[PDB]
Amino acid sequence: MIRILGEGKGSKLLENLKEKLEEIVKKEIGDVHVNVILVSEDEIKELNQQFRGQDRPTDVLTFPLMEEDVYGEIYVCPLIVEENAREFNNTFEKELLEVVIHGILHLAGYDHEFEDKNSKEMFEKQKKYVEEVWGEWRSNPSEDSDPGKR
Protein backbone atom coordinates (compact mmCIF):
# COMPACT_ATOMS: atom_id res chain seq x y z
CA MET A 1 0.00 0.00 0.00
CA ILE A 2 2.81 2.36 -0.93
CA ARG A 3 2.39 5.26 -3.33
CA ILE A 4 4.97 5.52 -6.08
CA LEU A 5 5.43 8.78 -7.95
CA GLY A 6 8.06 10.47 -10.09
CA GLU A 7 10.53 8.62 -12.28
CA GLY A 8 13.91 6.94 -11.93
CA LYS A 9 15.39 3.60 -10.97
CA GLY A 10 13.52 3.03 -7.73
CA SER A 11 9.91 2.17 -8.47
CA LYS A 12 10.74 -1.07 -10.25
CA LEU A 13 13.04 -1.83 -7.35
CA LEU A 14 10.24 -0.92 -4.97
CA GLU A 15 7.56 -2.95 -6.71
CA ASN A 16 9.99 -5.79 -6.15
CA LEU A 17 10.02 -5.46 -2.38
CA LYS A 18 6.69 -3.67 -2.24
CA GLU A 19 4.85 -6.36 -0.31
CA LYS A 20 7.97 -6.62 1.82
CA LEU A 21 7.29 -3.13 3.09
CA GLU A 22 3.57 -3.82 3.23
CA GLU A 23 4.50 -6.29 5.95
CA ILE A 24 6.26 -3.84 8.24
CA VAL A 25 3.62 -1.22 7.54
CA LYS A 26 0.92 -3.82 8.09
CA LYS A 27 2.64 -4.93 11.27
CA GLU A 28 2.72 -1.47 12.82
CA ILE A 29 -0.91 -0.83 11.94
CA GLY A 30 -1.58 -1.28 8.24
CA ASP A 31 -3.04 2.06 7.22
CA VAL A 32 -0.27 4.34 6.01
CA HIS A 33 0.48 6.09 2.74
CA VAL A 34 4.06 6.94 1.84
CA ASN A 35 4.40 8.83 -1.42
CA VAL A 36 7.90 8.39 -2.82
CA ILE A 37 9.14 10.76 -5.49
CA LEU A 38 11.80 9.26 -7.73
CA VAL A 39 14.12 11.97 -8.98
CA SER A 40 17.63 11.82 -10.38
CA GLU A 41 20.49 14.13 -9.47
CA ASP A 42 19.48 16.89 -11.85
CA GLU A 43 15.81 16.18 -11.28
CA ILE A 44 16.40 16.68 -7.57
CA LYS A 45 18.83 19.51 -8.22
CA GLU A 46 15.91 21.61 -9.36
CA LEU A 47 13.25 19.96 -7.23
CA ASN A 48 15.39 21.21 -4.37
CA GLN A 49 15.29 24.80 -5.56
CA GLN A 50 11.66 24.24 -6.48
CA PHE A 51 11.03 24.49 -2.76
CA ARG A 52 14.29 25.11 -0.95
CA GLY A 53 15.13 27.68 -3.59
CA GLN A 54 18.68 26.40 -3.39
CA ASP A 55 20.75 24.82 -6.13
CA ARG A 56 22.45 21.74 -4.71
CA PRO A 57 21.97 17.97 -4.88
CA THR A 58 21.50 15.71 -1.87
CA ASP A 59 21.28 12.09 -0.79
CA VAL A 60 17.53 12.12 -0.25
CA LEU A 61 14.94 14.86 0.05
CA THR A 62 12.48 14.55 2.91
CA PHE A 63 9.09 16.21 3.20
CA PRO A 64 8.61 18.65 6.09
CA LEU A 65 5.65 17.39 8.08
CA MET A 66 5.11 16.34 11.68
CA GLU A 67 1.95 14.28 11.98
CA GLU A 68 0.84 11.03 13.58
CA ASP A 69 2.78 8.99 11.04
CA VAL A 70 3.66 10.96 7.93
CA TYR A 71 1.22 10.40 5.10
CA GLY A 72 3.45 12.78 3.17
CA GLU A 73 5.58 12.66 0.04
CA ILE A 74 9.31 12.11 0.28
CA TYR A 75 11.75 12.34 -2.61
CA VAL A 76 14.71 10.06 -3.20
CA CYS A 77 17.59 10.06 -5.66
CA PRO A 78 19.49 6.80 -6.18
CA LEU A 79 21.77 8.80 -8.44
CA ILE A 80 23.73 10.44 -5.64
CA VAL A 81 23.17 7.46 -3.38
CA GLU A 82 24.68 5.10 -5.92
CA GLU A 83 27.52 7.54 -6.48
CA ASN A 84 28.39 7.04 -2.83
CA ALA A 85 27.81 3.30 -3.01
CA ARG A 86 30.17 3.29 -5.97
CA GLU A 87 33.16 4.32 -3.90
CA PHE A 88 31.73 2.88 -0.71
CA ASN A 89 31.00 -0.30 -2.63
CA ASN A 90 27.71 -0.12 -0.77
CA THR A 91 24.55 -1.89 -1.86
CA PHE A 92 22.41 0.80 -3.44
CA GLU A 93 19.59 -1.55 -2.50
CA LYS A 94 20.23 -1.05 1.20
CA GLU A 95 21.01 2.64 0.87
CA LEU A 96 17.73 2.93 -1.00
CA LEU A 97 15.93 0.55 1.32
CA GLU A 98 16.75 3.01 4.08
CA VAL A 99 14.84 5.85 2.46
CA VAL A 100 12.17 3.26 1.75
CA ILE A 101 11.72 2.15 5.34
CA HIS A 102 12.60 5.70 6.31
CA GLY A 103 8.90 6.33 5.84
CA ILE A 104 7.64 3.29 7.72
CA LEU A 105 10.46 3.16 10.24
CA HIS A 106 9.34 6.71 10.95
CA LEU A 107 5.79 5.93 12.01
CA ALA A 108 7.19 2.56 13.04
CA GLY A 109 8.06 4.11 16.38
CA TYR A 110 8.75 7.74 17.21
CA ASP A 111 5.90 10.12 16.47
CA HIS A 112 6.81 13.75 15.88
CA GLU A 113 10.01 13.56 17.90
CA PHE A 114 13.09 12.16 16.20
CA GLU A 115 15.05 13.94 18.90
CA ASP A 116 18.64 14.70 17.98
CA LYS A 117 17.80 13.72 14.42
CA ASN A 118 17.84 10.03 15.26
CA SER A 119 18.56 7.82 18.24
CA LYS A 120 20.02 4.38 18.86
CA GLU A 121 16.44 3.18 18.66
CA MET A 122 15.82 4.62 15.21
CA PHE A 123 19.15 3.19 14.13
CA GLU A 124 18.51 -0.40 15.16
CA LYS A 125 14.81 -0.05 14.42
CA GLN A 126 15.85 1.19 11.00
CA LYS A 127 18.28 -1.66 10.44
CA LYS A 128 15.53 -4.02 11.55
CA TYR A 129 13.19 -3.37 8.66
CA VAL A 130 16.18 -2.78 6.41
CA GLU A 131 17.52 -6.27 6.96
CA GLU A 132 13.98 -7.61 7.07
CA VAL A 133 12.96 -5.93 3.84
CA TRP A 134 16.40 -6.53 2.37
CA GLY A 135 15.92 -10.10 3.55
CA GLU A 136 14.43 -10.64 0.11
CA TRP A 137 16.82 -8.70 -2.09
CA ARG A 138 19.40 -10.50 0.01
CA SER A 139 18.94 -13.38 -2.41
CA ASN A 140 20.42 -10.98 -4.94
CA PRO A 141 23.48 -9.44 -3.29
CA SER A 142 26.19 -7.43 -5.00
CA GLU A 143 23.69 -6.15 -7.54
CA ASP A 144 26.70 -5.59 -9.76
CA SER A 145 28.95 -7.53 -12.11
CA ASP A 146 32.27 -7.26 -10.30
CA PRO A 147 34.35 -9.87 -12.13
CA GLY A 148 35.87 -11.07 -8.88
CA LYS A 149 33.75 -12.34 -6.01
CA ARG A 150 32.36 -15.76 -6.84
Swiss-Prot record:
- EC numbers listed for it are 3.1.-.-
The record's remark on the cofactor is:
Binds 1 zinc ion.
Please state what class of enzyme this protein is.
Answer: hydrolase
Predominant location category:
cytoplasm
- Residues bound to Zn(2+) are H102, H106, H112
Q: Which UniProt keywords apply?
A: Cytoplasm, Endonuclease, Hydrolase, Metal-binding, Nuclease, Ribosome biogenesis, rRNA processing, Zinc
Q: Per its record, what are the GO molecular function terms?
A: metalloendopeptidase activity; RNA endonuclease activity; zinc ion binding
User: What GO biological process terms does the UniProt entry carry, in alphabetical order?
Assistant: rRNA processing
Q: Does the keyword Repeat apply?
A: no
**Residue stretches in coiled coil:** none
Q: Which GO terms describe its cellular component?
A: cytoplasm
Q: Where in the cell is it found?
A: Cytoplasm
Task: Note the Pfam families from the entry.
Answer: YbeY
- Which cofactors, by name? Zn(2+)
Q: Which family does it belong to?
A: Belongs to the endoribonuclease YbeY family.
Q: Which HAMAP family match?
A: Endoribonucl_YbeY (MF_00009)
What job does this protein perform? Answer: Single strand-specific metallo-endoribonuclease involved in late-stage 70S ribosome quality control and in maturation of the 3' terminus of the 16S rRNA.
Instruction: Return the protein name.
Output: Endoribonuclease YbeY
Species, as recorded? Thermotoga maritima (strain ATCC 43589 / DSM 3109 / JCM 10099 / NBRC 100826 / MSB8)
